[PDB]
Design a protein around this ligand. Structure first.
Ligand SMILES: [Mg+2]
Ligand SMILES: [Zn+2]
Ligand SMILES: [Zn+2]
Lengths: 1421, 134, 107, 87
């Protein structure tokens, strides 16, 4: 850096990894490093001709470099070299060297397996440089002969010489950093010398090693072995030289002197009187120091510790992540022009502003270039100085030399010159990046307008609290000041707060009204709330935009009074039209329910969380989409300014009074808890009296506990609901719950009525002590009181027992939180590191740094997630009769035409056959759409997020044109029919003059058009909306415009987007799956399970659906449950016995005296095996004695004699004798095969099968979708392949949480579908919503390479992506070592490589190039 | 006072509410490098090639220590010390950049070895402000 | 296509690639009981002709490597008798567009 | 190769300007304006290089051209003058 150089300035387009040849190492070297010493010889404390040494770079601030004579800052440093006394293995290649040895003849250097071998021929064909070496190794490793001759391809009888000697190959093992071979009375054992290995490698043919993973030019296998060691210059190993009489050499400088010392020891030892078994000693030492220098943390070897005992930094350890060069110095950096302080919110800053403390503003600078525009201002700032606020700190001349205004003797008489830079203070409205770490979002870093303020905290608008996830509980934030006119433009035009308002994470806004303003807005907007003139005038003035027009009061005659609703609508801009229905809202909104804003005026409904919050159909969501992100950001401020002012004067509080519930309501709660406790006891005695019958697939204990905790919860809920109801509307806690500002039911419930049952690990407090939860209780006490049910409210106070059990469950929370914060952290990173390089291209395609297609068009529709809104697809639902009434037009039917009251043409349109052909086709298409939609969304769900809010367009049109819902339209049938048809052709996502790209286009707009045809049908357009030609034409031009606006922008870094959009919601998960249908593992642990593509999953299960015409029949369901649920002989057996009953015709056992007499009317072993079966067990599993018997009979065939008692006999018995010395010992083996091995009925792995009456939305004969509940089977095991073929089931519908299995049986395509479902169900369970495309992209990425690619170290990170890119995640040094050994070439298209190289990445703003056209330039002047 | 922030009575803050003292103790030793060669507590000055600090040395007395009454600031040298090499070299202790106060108590003793040992404490009063936690 | 009950001996299995250009398929009777292609989650896979595939790569400026893959052993790949290199056009219904088409190249 | 340049006739990227192309044009032009480059629009008392650049873009008097790279390495060049600026 810094001085001028004539050398051409280019950018790194490629990185060619390879290995150093010793020859290169010498050529490239500036010094032959000879002595371990650093200086002080001849006396002089100044670098020696041996180590460090000037030839390499400077130690001092000398200006000298000897080599370049440039001086510390400019000089990069130059490599020296050490010639090693013997060759040594490069520690990082020992395993590869071993594998190369295993592939080649350790004598003639020929590759052990020729193109003569068929398997080898297939292995050789492998194009992957690494996968080839893998296949080659596996084939050659088990070849212990270097063949002289081999059978010819023509005939295997007449053998052909392939070349090569006839030597036996050794069985190589790794013993430390040595390789030992074993050839073939008794095997020959000897170490393989580094020289010998090297010589054999030098003899491997180019064709042979390029067939292995290697490269003739860049990485010849012989270069894995080191002979000439490069010596890194001082800037790699800086001598931190403090004072004069002291220095401080780097770890690497010591380790190199150790290498040097060991080397001279060896070279002097071998040259002189070599004892040859003292030479091998010093050589092992040199091998150790050269190994331990590069990697010190070697597998099962001692660490090469310092004097101190301190392990020694290996070069490896330097680069090894989180703090390595890669993760800590390159993907992350500490940076200049950055600030940080405590944040505290401000109601008087605008949404997009940031309060910067004067001190911070006075430190951070912007380099402004002196130009005729600012020359005057800039001279004032320079005059002001570095101490006054709007001032400057430095003046940079043309010369490039910096003037310090703090000390310059000319600081007062500086006369600026165009071209000079004035490093001025950051002033109001400078764009700056503001950030709250962890940065899990696009929104965790947004651009703000500076507002220089007093006091030491960063001030922010409260509505921007939510995207940052900031509190003022003492939170600090980072500010980053851009320095280019260009990087500011980036901040302002791409990441400024107003733009970031409607987030693509959930196609909804990520900011809304909160806290005071949310609480106060409900309060202001009540029917009961009225404002006197005095205050109305202040509340108006406070709105900075206010047109200066005092609105006419709602009440005039008794007293001029305005309503809350009224004067709040002053902040709501004109043309804002919102409609919402809650509970039972009518147009005469009785409860002040729902919301109705017309032309930006509140007609009815209280303004709370659903309206003014960060809601999907938000007042914010609409104001952005309709008026601009700017207009919307203003609205945040305006709403705040009014509401906050009104609340400042109304006031708001909370006290113990607000937790206090009515005396009789308390009596009612105490009773509710009491009756529940008794309901529990009644069950507790029922189970103690053995009358309680266990639930299917549940222990008596499991069954009892389920009921108990169900009652004790039902109890807490009811008790709370009593307080909730009894709390007046004046209850401050209720008031906060109502606005939605803070709190919920459970908060009220726990504080006022009852805290509830405490739980740890899903169950009530367990007996930690022998049969008791605490010593304060008696043994075997299953009571609500003993197992942790907190009878009391927070108001009443907990008992000592209650207090501890609460503390037990409480602690489980704190741990689980701590653990999830960790677990979700990594999940986010692996998601990001797996999707980084995914971007939308100028061809609407979604590709990675390899240009491999992931999505053929972003999120299957090609739309930007932010420009989407949930919309209803009308044609899907309802009766066919109601659809007909809505959409059918029949100009040939006197009572099914359009009345002339609807359009002018009405009278003359009746009977028009040619026109009926248009409406007939129009309707035939609406019918087509209806059946298609019903194929897509099977449940008949109509509300789907789509891109153009058509409802709003028609709304605005009606308002705009003052559509009179009385006089007939001037539209024609052709105007509507063909106008809609023509609009469809202009909704372009993909442009391309070919059938592929064009059909792609048709598909991408298939759903939107369905909605379009649905909303703009002839009858709707004329009868419903009462559109004029003008109005209609406008609706069309707007749908078109809005649609085009909605498509994704090429450059969209859609990969990171998706990653973060799944990741950040994961960090907000409570979990695991409540504290108790099936209890399937969910949230963070199941998400970890998914991304890892874990084979052994926690809750594997099937969902078997019954055959179509069998859904209602429970008996059919029972039959299948019976047919699939696995049953063993073990499960029905009481006991197994061996007797000595020598006569088969008689019996010692008198019970069986009857059993023999019968099974011996219409030679054997004297030893009998008798099994007693449990009637009860046989009854739950609906088994017969003969059923069991026959199963045993077929298991042993003609080898075991089976007799059995009948289903009537008092005791259920099975008698077994063996067929045809040492016989008794055999029966014990049979009894194990009988219990353990034998399967009676059911499918293996399918362990517990539950019957469930699931609801199902299905079309009725009449047409309308109707709840048709079906019987369904839930498994406790997986065997898809087998349960699919079972009769009585719907194999077209069967599902499994194990998508690994779906992939295996139904294909990668179905595997993708199931994978999405499972990812979605993790997110959906936590309530939270993530837009389809994000989850789709992750799922698509894990699937493109046919099969399930994990989001792990050995998943995505083992792709053919950039070596530099992949090292940036998890296997860093190992990755880079393989890069050299296989001569990898990094394309440099991954974000990561350009981040490492400090180059403008091909991302967003980097996706294209900018050029000056001299032609147009000369045309403009 | 939104999102866990609070309003405080300025009038009360003045009257002394939640106002606190703050002390910091800085320490040094006259190290004995080899035999006879010892570090010296003294107010140094520009002599041959000594790497002196940027801060004000003028607050130090001849003993290389500030007097207890004195008000210190920024990088003001609170302990003056020299190290000899083979004239002198600086080894003086300046007050923490990010801090300021009034010299509180200055302690002059001997460490077990028999060498000069010094502890300088600086007192500052910290009045509740806008970013302060409670 | 040989539909076998339990097993085809490895001595018999040697004969499968023994008579080219003709290709031989071994299918276990038990796997064929249920037509997996009929499943809810299984979309329609369409085998593309040499010309159809050539056009695909042309129109998206693709190298075969760039195309999303399907294993030669994938249940649907086996059903359609897909050979290496054969490209399949997969048409699935979408909640975003109505219908979406992906392509998968064989391995 | 120069099979790289896709011709004006038969070009298929959006005839509209991307949010990024706008951010980079405005930035580039403001940077150029800021370091005393000739301005093609009449500054009607304007002084912020971004505000001047915005005026330049608004009058389509920006003499830059966007080179849109395709995944294969080919490209379509589009002039600031010809791109639709909806945004
Ligand atoms: Mg906090
Ligand atoms: Zn140099
Ligand atoms: Zn050989």
């Amino acid at each position: 850096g810094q001085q001028y150089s004539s050398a051409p300035l280019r950018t790194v387009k490629e990185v060619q990894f390879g290995l150093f040849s010793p020859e290169e190492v010498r050529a490239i070297s500036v010094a032959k490093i000879r002595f371990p010493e650093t200086m002080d010889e001849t006396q002089t404390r100044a670098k020696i001709g041996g180590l460090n040494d000037p030839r390499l770079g400077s130690i001092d601030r000398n200006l000298k470099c000897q080599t370049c004579q440039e001086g510390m800052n400019e000089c990069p440093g130059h490599f020296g070299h050490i010639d090693l006394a013997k060759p040594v293995f490069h520690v990082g290649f020992i395993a590869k060297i071993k594998k190369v040895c295993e592939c080649v003849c350790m004598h003639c250097g020929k590759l052990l397996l020729d193109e003569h071998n068929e398997l080898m021929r297939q292995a050789l064909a492998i194009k992957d440089s690494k996968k080839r070496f893998a296949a080659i190794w596996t084939l050659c490793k088990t070849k212990m002969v270097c063949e002289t001759d081999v059978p010819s391809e023509d005939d295997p009888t007449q053998l052909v010489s392939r070349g090569g000697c006839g030597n036996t190959q050794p069985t190589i093992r790794k013993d430390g950093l040595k390789l030992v071979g074993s050839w073939k009375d008794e095997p020959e054992l000897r170490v393989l010398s580094t020289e010998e290995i090297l010589n054999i490698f030098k003899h491997i043919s180019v064709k042979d090693f390029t067939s292995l993973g290697f490269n003739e030019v860049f990485s010849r296998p012989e270069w894995m072995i080191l002979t000439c060691l490069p010596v890194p210059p001082p800037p790699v190993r800086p001598s931190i030289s403090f004072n004069e009489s002291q220095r401080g050499e780097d770890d690497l400088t010591f380790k190199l002197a150790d290498i040097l010392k060991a080397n001279i020891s060896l070279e002097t030892l071998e040259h002189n009187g070599a004892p040859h078994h003292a030479i091998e000693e010093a050589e092992s030492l040199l091998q150790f120091h050269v190994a331990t220098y590069m990697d010190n943390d070697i597998a099962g070897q001692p660490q090469a510790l310092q004097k101190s005992g301190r392990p020694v930094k290996s070069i490896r350890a330097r680069l090894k992540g989180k703090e390595g060069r890669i993760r800590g110095n390159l993907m992350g950096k500490r940076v200049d022009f950055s600030a940080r302080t405590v944040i505290s919110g401000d109601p008087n800053l605008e949404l997009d502003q940031v309060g910067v403390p004067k001190s911070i503003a006075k430190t951070l600078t912007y380099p402004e270039v002196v130009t005729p525009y600012n020359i005057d201002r800039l001279t004032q700032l320079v005059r002001n100085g570095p101490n006054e606020h709007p001032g400057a700190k430095y003046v940079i001349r043309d010369s490039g030399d910096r003037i310090d205004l703090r000390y310059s003797k000319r600081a007062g008489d500086i006369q600026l010159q165009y071209g000079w830079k004035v490093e001025r203070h950051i002033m109001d409205n400078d764009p700056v990046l503001f950030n709250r770490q962890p940065s899990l979002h696009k929104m965790s870093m947004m651009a703000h307008r500076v507002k220089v303020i007093p006091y030491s905290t960063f001030r922010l608008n409260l509505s921007v609290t939510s995207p940052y996830n900031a509190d003022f509980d003492g939170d600090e934030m980072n500010l980053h000041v851009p320095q280019s006119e260009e990087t500011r433009a980036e901040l302002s035009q791409l990441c400024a707060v107003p733009l970031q308002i409607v987030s693509p994470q959930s196609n909804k806004p990520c900011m809304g009204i909160v806290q005071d303003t949310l609480c106060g807005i409900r309060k202001l907007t009540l029917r009961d709330t009225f404002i006197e003139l005095d205050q109305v005038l202040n509340m108006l003035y406070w709105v900075p935009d206010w047109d200066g027009v005092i609105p006419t009061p709602a009440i005039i005659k008794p007293k001029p009074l305005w309503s809350g609703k009224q004067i709040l609508s002053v902040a709501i801009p004109n043309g804002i039209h919102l409609q919402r229905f809650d509970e039972g809202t009518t147009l005469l909104s009785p409860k002040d329910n729902g919301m109705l804003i017309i032309d930006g005026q509140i007609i009815f409904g209280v303004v709370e969380k659903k309206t003014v919050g960060s809601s999907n159909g938000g007042l914010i969501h609409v104001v952005t989409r309709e008026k601009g992100p700017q207009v919307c950001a203003k609205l945040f401020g305006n709403i705040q300014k009014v509401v906050n002012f009104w609340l400042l004067h109304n006031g708001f509080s909370t006290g113990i009074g607000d937790t206090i519930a009515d005396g009789p309501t308390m009596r009612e709660i105490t009773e509710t808890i009491a009756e529940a406790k008794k309901k529990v006891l009644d069950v507790t005695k029922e189970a103690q009296a053995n009358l309680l019958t266990a639930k299917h697939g549940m222990t008596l204990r499991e069954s009892f506990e389920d009921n108990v905790v169900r009652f004790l919860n039902e109890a807490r809920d009811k008790a709370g609901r009593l307080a909730e109801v009894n709390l007046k509307d004046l209850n401050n806690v209720k008031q906060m719950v109502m606005a939605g500002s803070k709190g919920s039911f459970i908060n009220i419930a726990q504080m006022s009525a009852c805290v509830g049952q405490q739980s740890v690990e899903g169950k009530r407090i367990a007996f930690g002590f022998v049969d008791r939860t605490l010593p304060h209780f008696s043994k075997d006490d299953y009571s609500p009181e003993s197992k942790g049910f907190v009878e009391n409210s927070y108001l009443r106070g907990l008992t000592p027992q209650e207090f501890f059990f609460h503390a037990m469950g409480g602690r489980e929370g704190l741990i689980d939180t701590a653990v999830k914060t960790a677990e979700t952290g990594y999940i986010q990173r692996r998601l990001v590191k797996a999707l980084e390089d995914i971007m939308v291209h100028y061809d609407n395609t979604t590709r990675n740094s390899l240009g491999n297609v992931i999505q053929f068009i972003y999120g299957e529709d090609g739309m930007d997630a932010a420009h989407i809104e949930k919309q209803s697809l009308d044609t899907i639902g309802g009766s066919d009769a109601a659809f007909e009434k809505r959409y059918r037009v029949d100009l040939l039917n006197t009572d099914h035409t359009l009345d002339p009251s609807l359009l002018e043409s009405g009278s003359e349109i009746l009977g028009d056959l040619k026109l009926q052909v248009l409406l007939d086709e129009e309707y035939k298409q609406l019918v087509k759409d209806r059946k298609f939609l019903r194929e897509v969304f099977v449940d008949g769900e109509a509300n789907w997020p789509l891109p153009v809010n058509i409802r709003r367009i028609i709304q605005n049109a009606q308002q705009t044109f003052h559509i009179d819902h009385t006089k007939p339209s001037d539209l024609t049938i052709k105007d509507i029919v063909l106008g809609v048809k023509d609009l469809q052709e202009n909704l372009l996502v993909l442009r391309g003059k070919n059938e592929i790209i064009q059909n792609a286009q048709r598909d991408a707009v298939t759903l939107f058009c369905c909605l379009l045809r649905s909303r703009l049908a002839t009858r709707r357009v004329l009868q419903e909306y009462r559109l004029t030609k003008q109005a209609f034409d406008w609706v069309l031009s707007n749908i078109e415009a809005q649609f085009l606006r909605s498509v994704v922008h090429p450059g969209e870094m859609v990969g990171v987007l998706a990653a973060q959009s799944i990741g950040e919601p994961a960090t907000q998960m409570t979990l695991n799956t409540f504290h108790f249908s099936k209890k399937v593992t969910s949230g963070v642990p199941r998400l970890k399970e998914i991304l890892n593509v874990a084979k052994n999953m926690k809750t594997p299960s099937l969902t078997v659906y019954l055959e179509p015409g069998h859904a209602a029949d429970q008996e059919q369901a029972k039959l299948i449950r019976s047919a699939i649920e696995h049953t063993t002989l073990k499960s029905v057996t009481i006991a197994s016995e061996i007797y000595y009953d020598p006569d088969p015709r008689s019996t010692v056992i008198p019970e069986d005296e009857e059993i023999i007499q019968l099974h011996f009317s219409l030679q054997q072993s004297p030893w009998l095996l008798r099994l007693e079966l449990d009637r009860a067990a046989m009854n739950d599993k609906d088994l017969t004695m003969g059923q069991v018997g026959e199963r045993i009979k077929q298991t042993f065939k003609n080898d075991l004699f089976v007799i059995w008692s009948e289903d009537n006999d008092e005791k259920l018995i099975i008698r077994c004798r063996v067929v045809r010395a040492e016989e008794d010992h055999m029966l014990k083996k049979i009894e194990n095969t009988m219990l353990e091995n034998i399967t009676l009925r059911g499918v293996e792995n399918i362990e517990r099968v539950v019957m469930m009456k699931y609801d199902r939305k299905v079309p009725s004969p009449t047409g309308e979708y109707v709840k048709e509940p079906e019987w369904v089977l839930e498994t406790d095991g997986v065997n898809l392949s087998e349960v699919m073929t079972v009769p009585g089931i719907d194999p077209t519908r069967i599902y499994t949480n194990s998508f690994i299995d779906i992939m295996e049986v139904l294909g990668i395509e179905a595997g993708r579908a199931a994978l999405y479902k499972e990812v979605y169900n993790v997110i959906a369970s936590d309530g939270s919503y993530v837009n389809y495309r994000h989850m789709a992209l992750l799922v698509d990425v894990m699937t493109t390479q046919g099969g399930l690619t994990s989001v792990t170290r050995h998943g995505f990170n083992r792709s053919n992506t950039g070596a530099l890119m992949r090292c940036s995640f998890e296997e860093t040094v190992e990755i880079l070592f393989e890069a050299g050994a296989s001569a990898e070439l990094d394309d440099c298209r991954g974000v990561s490589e350009n981040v490492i190289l400090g180059q403008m990445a091909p991302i967003g703003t980097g996706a294209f190039d900018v050029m000056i056209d001299e032609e147009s330039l000369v045309k403009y002047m | 006072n939104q999102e866990d922030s609070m309003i405080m009575n300025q009038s009360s803050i003045d009257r002394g509410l939640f106002r606190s003292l703050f002390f910091r103790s800085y320490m040094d030793q006259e190290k004995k490098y080899g035999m006879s060669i010892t570090e010296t507590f003294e107010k140094p000055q520009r002599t041959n090639t000594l790497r002196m600090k940027h801060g004000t040395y003028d607050k130090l007395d001849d003993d290389g220590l500030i007097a207890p009454g004195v008000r210190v600031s920024g990088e003001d040298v609170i302990i003056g010390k020299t190290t000899p090499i083979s004239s002198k070299r600086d080894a003086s202790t300046p007050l923490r950049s990010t801090e300021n106060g009034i010299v509180d108590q200055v302690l002059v003793t001997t460490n077990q070895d028999g060498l000069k040992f010094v502890k300088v404490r600086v007192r500052t009063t910290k009045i509740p402000q806008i970013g302060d936690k409670f | 296509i040989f539909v076998y009950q339990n097993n085809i001996t490895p001595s018999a299995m040697k004969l499968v690639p023994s008579i080219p250009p003709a290709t031989i398929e071994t299918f276990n009777e038990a796997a064929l009981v249920v037509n997996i292609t009929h499943h809810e989650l299984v979309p329609k896979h369409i085998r593309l002709s040499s010309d159809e595939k050539r056009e695909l790569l042309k129109r998206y400026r693709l190298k075969e490597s760039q195309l999303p893959r399907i294993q030669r052993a994938d249940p649907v790949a086996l059903y359609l008798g897909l050979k290496r290199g054969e490209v399949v056009k997969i048409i699935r219904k979408s909640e975003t567009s109505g219908r979406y088409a992906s392509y998968r190249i064989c391995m | 190769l120069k099979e790289k340049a896709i011709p004006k006739d038969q070009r298929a990227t959006t005839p509209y300007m991307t949010k990024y192309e706008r951010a980079r044009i405005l930035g580039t032009r403001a940077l150029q304006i800021s370091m005393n480059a000739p301005v093609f629009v009449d500054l009607e008392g304007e002084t912020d290089p971004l505000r001047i650049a915005m005026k330049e873009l608004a009058e389509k008097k920006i003499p830059l051209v966007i080179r849109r790279y395709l995944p294969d390495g080919s490209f379509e060049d589009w002039s600031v003058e010809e791109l639709i600026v909806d945004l």
